[PDB]
Amino acid sequence: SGFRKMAFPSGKVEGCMVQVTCGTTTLNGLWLDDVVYCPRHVICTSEDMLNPNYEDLLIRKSNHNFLVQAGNVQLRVIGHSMQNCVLKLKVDTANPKTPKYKFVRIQPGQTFSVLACYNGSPSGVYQCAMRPNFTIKGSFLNGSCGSVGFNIDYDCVSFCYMHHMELPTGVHAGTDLEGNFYGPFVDRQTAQAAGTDTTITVNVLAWLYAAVINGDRWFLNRFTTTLNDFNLVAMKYNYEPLTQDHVDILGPLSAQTGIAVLDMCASLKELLQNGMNGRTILGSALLEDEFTPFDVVRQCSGVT
Amino acid sequence: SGFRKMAFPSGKVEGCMVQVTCGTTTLNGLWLDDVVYCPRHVICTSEDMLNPNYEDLLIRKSNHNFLVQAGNVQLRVIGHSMQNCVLKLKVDTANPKTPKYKFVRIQPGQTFSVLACYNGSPSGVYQCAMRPNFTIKGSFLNGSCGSVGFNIDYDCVSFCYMHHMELPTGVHAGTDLEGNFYGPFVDRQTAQAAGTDTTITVNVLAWLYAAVINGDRWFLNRFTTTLNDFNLVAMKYNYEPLTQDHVDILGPLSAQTGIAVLDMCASLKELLQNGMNGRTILGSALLEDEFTPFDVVRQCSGVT
Numbered sequence: 356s357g358f359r360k361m362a363f364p365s366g367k368v369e370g371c372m373v374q375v376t377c378g379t380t381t382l383n384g385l386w387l388d389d390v391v392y393c394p395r396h397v398i399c400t401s402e403d404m405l406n407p408n409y410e411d412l413l414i415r416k417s418n419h420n421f422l423v424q425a426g427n428v429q430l431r432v433i434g435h436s437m438q439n440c441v442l443k444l445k446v447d448t449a450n451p452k453t454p455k456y457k458f459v460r461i462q463p464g465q466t467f468s469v470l471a472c473y474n475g476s477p478s479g480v481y482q483c484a485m486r487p488n489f490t491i492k493g494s495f496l497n498g499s500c501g502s503v504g505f506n507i508d509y510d511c512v513s514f515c516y517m518h519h520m521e522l523p524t525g526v527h528a529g530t531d532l533e534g535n536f537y538g539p540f541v542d543r544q545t546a547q548a549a550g551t552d553t554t555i556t557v558n559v560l561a562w563l564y565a566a567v568i569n570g571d572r573w574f575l576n577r578f579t580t581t582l583n584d585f586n587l588v589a590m591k592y593n594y595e596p597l598t599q600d601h602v603d604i605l606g607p608l609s610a611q612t613g614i615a616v617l618d619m620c621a622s623l624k625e626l627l628q629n630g631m632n633g634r635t636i637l638g639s640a641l642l643e644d645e646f647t648p649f650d651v652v653r654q655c656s657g658v659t
Numbered sequence: 660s661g662f663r664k665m666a667f668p669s670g671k672v673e674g675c676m677v678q679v680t681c682g683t684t685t686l687n688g689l690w691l692d693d694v695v696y697c698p699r700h701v702i703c704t705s706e707d708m709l710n711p712n713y714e715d716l717l718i719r720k721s722n723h724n725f726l727v728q729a730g731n732v733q734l735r736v737i738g739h740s741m742q743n744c745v746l747k748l749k750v751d752t753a754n755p756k757t758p759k760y761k762f763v764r765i766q767p768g769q770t771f772s773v774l775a776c777y778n779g780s781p782s783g784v785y786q787c788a789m790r791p792n793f794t795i796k797g798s799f800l801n802g803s804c805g806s807v808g809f810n811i812d813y814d815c816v817s818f819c820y821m822h823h824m825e826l827p828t829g830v831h832a833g834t835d836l837e838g839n840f841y842g843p844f845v846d847r848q849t850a851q852a853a854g855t856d857t858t859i860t861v862n863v864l865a866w867l868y869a870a871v872i873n874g875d876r877w878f879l880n881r882f883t884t885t886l887n888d889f890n891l892v893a894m895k896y897n898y899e900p901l902t903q904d905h906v907d908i909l910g911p912l913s914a915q916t917g918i919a920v921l922d923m924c925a926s927l928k929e930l931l932q933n934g935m936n937g938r939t940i941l942g943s944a945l946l947e948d949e950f951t952p953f954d955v956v957r958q959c960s961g962v963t
């Protein structure tokens with residue numbers, strides 16, 4: 356037993372990290388097969404970031420201006436192209452360490468592991484959630500751009516995120532592996548506000564089920580509620596409205612614990628209206644929303 | 660910016676995980692060079708765990724009774740020995756994926772990454788702290804035994820922990836890589852209580868410095884304190900007494916932020932005596948103690 360904010364083993368993704376330099380700008384690239392994927396702002400100087408014309412900027416760049424280093428060996432660039440906000444640098448060698456992989460665009464509320472990188476080298480790994488306002492609350496310094504978010508299903512790595520920027524607010528914005536930003540953000544040094552961030556209700560519910568499984572039951576009450584009544588409370592507290600789809604996904608956890616989803620919603624409701632009163636749940640003094648019901652089932656069953 | 664409970668990249672340790680089976684018991688092993696290290700309780704049946712005589716039990720086992728599988732290939736055992744609570748299975752092949760490594764016994768309050776494993780396969784990675792009472796608050800199911808804790812210094816992996824058991828309390832106990840348990844625990848299915856767990860004061864202080872660096876400054880006050888006055892408060896709140904050694908380690912953070920260590924102690928003091936009043940620090944509603952001052956400096960500078 357025990358419940359932790361666990362990230363996937365990062366080994367398969369370490370093997371794909373490269374360093375991409377263009378001019379005086381260095382960031383991370385993702386090497387899969389004979390292609391290196393990196394944020395297109397690698398072609399800009401901080402001066403260009405005010406309002407870059409990426410099409411015009413890329414036109415003054417040749418395959419030889421993109422320096423791609425895999426550890427200590429240089430990769431030969433034989434093609435370059437821009438797909439949305441990412442650059443695809445065709446190299447002459449397929450990465451020997453390319454795992455089975457998919458490029459997926461995740462939905463808000465879903466979770467993933469980020470392998471933070473600097474100069475193509477990994478520094479750490481942590482578990483994130485794509486916020487409902489399409490930002491992530493990461494840990495990213497200068498040069499962390501190009502670091503990827505991913506999930507793993509036995510041997511296949513589903514790359515879902517590539518890091519691009521930190522908003523003036525301190526939250527992080529980025530793209531899927533086709534270069535489409537999650538949210539309204541554009542890769543420009545301009546003030547961009549993220550929308551109202553809501554709490555991922557289904558994830559909090561899943562984490563409440565994980566708490567019951569792990570012995571923390573103090574918050575369980577003698578009450579129940581309806582989806583409509585719960586959603587009136589969730590609205591007031593800027594929680595995502597719970598749907599029958601969310602209840603359906605909570606099914607395995609409801610079955611494992613023997614606690615009906617609406618019963619757990621009534622515990623959540625009392626916790627929202629009354630607070631924790633100085634108590635903790637799974638070592639936390641606030642309601643955790645970065646575990647999906649799939650993460651809870653997975654961690655509580657030891658899927659490798 | 661942004662502050663996360665970050666684990667080290669787990670790739671170098673994934674390459675060392677093997678599955679060790681003895682009789683009907685399966686757990687994880689750590690393959691470095693021509694040696695596989697695993698908990699000695701792999702030789703026991705749950706019946707034997709009541710009061711095992713490991714010396715007597717091991718004597719009925721031959722090199723051929725220890726099944727060591729690395730992924731899908733079988734390792735040939737040519738020697739077996741017991742060092743304290745670990746078994747060292749000499750195999751005929753040196754692990755091709757052995758990284759530069761050290762076996763280190765960490766001090767309470769220090770942090771490390773755990774690569775949770777089942778049947779020799781990795782399921783996840785998370786950052787832990789060795790508690791002052793020598794337990795860890797992990798996430799470990801049946802078969803997770805043999806999973807290791809470690810730190811990384813550029814290319815060298817310092818293995819510091821091997822998982823052995825879950826105490827009746829739900830907290831975790833284990834050994835260093837020489838088989839010596841951290842704490843008073845013995846590898847036996849007997850009621851073993853961990854001592855009073857205290858809060859790692861120097862780590863909370865370091866995390867308060869990380870909060871200031873990342874923009875969360877609400878908790879900073881117009882007050883100061885002395886080491887003696889602070890320690891009277893820390894005692895009442897079951898915090899570890901702060902020494903001049905702890906203040907010395909906090910030096911880089913004090914210098915980076917411009918906030919004297921004793922000034923930060925006075926903010927901690929007011930937070931202990933008054934609470935957070937519904938506010939958060941680095942997205943947390945409680946005082947975090949699982950980041951050492953080295954982790955804060957490291958994450959805030961992007962060491963790879």
Ligand SMILES: O=C(Nc1nncn1C1CC1)[C@@H]1COc2ccc(Cl)cc21
Pocket residue numbers: 396404495496497498499500519520521522527541542543544545660
């Ligand atoms: O934010 C950026 N890098 C970044 N991402 N996480 C952390 N950081 C560094 C702390 C700043 C760069 C700098 O200014 C811009 C503007 C637009 C783009 Cl597309 C990218 C950047």
Ligand SMILES: O=C(Nc1nncn1C1CC1)[C@@H]1COc2ccc(Cl)cc21
Pocket residue numbers: 356700708799800801802803804823824825826831845846847848849
């Ligand atoms: O606790 C143990 N495994 C374990 N460690 N983390 C999680 N778990 C499983 C949930 C139980 C085994 C079972 O009983 C004992 C008694 C003594 C030893 Cl040395 C080892 C064990």
